[PDB]
Design a protein around this ligand. Structure first.
Ligand SMILES: [Ca+2]
Lengths: 51, 51
């Protein structure tokens, strides 16, 4: 009863078929695993330029 | 180890076309100039005093 079961922009066929952006990890082909990016940012250095 | 800045070059240092195996500037010229840092090509790339 839903175009997109997982809720992500890709419909159940799309996920099941594997016919989308192929870079997506393969488990997200399951219509219950959200094809969904989780992006955090890491610090490595800090520069203090006195004015 | 640190990073002075990051320049997504603007329209001046841009490259119109680049055939495979070619270069920009092409084989005959001298290298071009990346002079600035922001999206309008007005302000040159700065550094610290102790830098
Ligand atoms: Ca469905």
């Amino acid at each position: 009863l839903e175009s997109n079961t997982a809720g992500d922009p890709y419909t159940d066929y799309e996920k099941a078929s594997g016919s989308f952006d192929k870079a997506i990890k393969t488990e997200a082909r399951d219509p219950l695993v959200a094809a969904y990016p989780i992006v955090g940012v890491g610090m490595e250095k800090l520069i203090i330029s006195t004015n | 180890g640190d990073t002075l800045s990051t320049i997504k070059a603007q329209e001046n240092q841009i490259g119109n076309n680049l055939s495979p195996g070619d270069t920009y500037p092409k084989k005959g010229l001298s290298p071009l100039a990346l002079n600035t840092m922001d999206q309008f090509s007005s302000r040159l790339i700065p550094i610290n005093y102790d830098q």
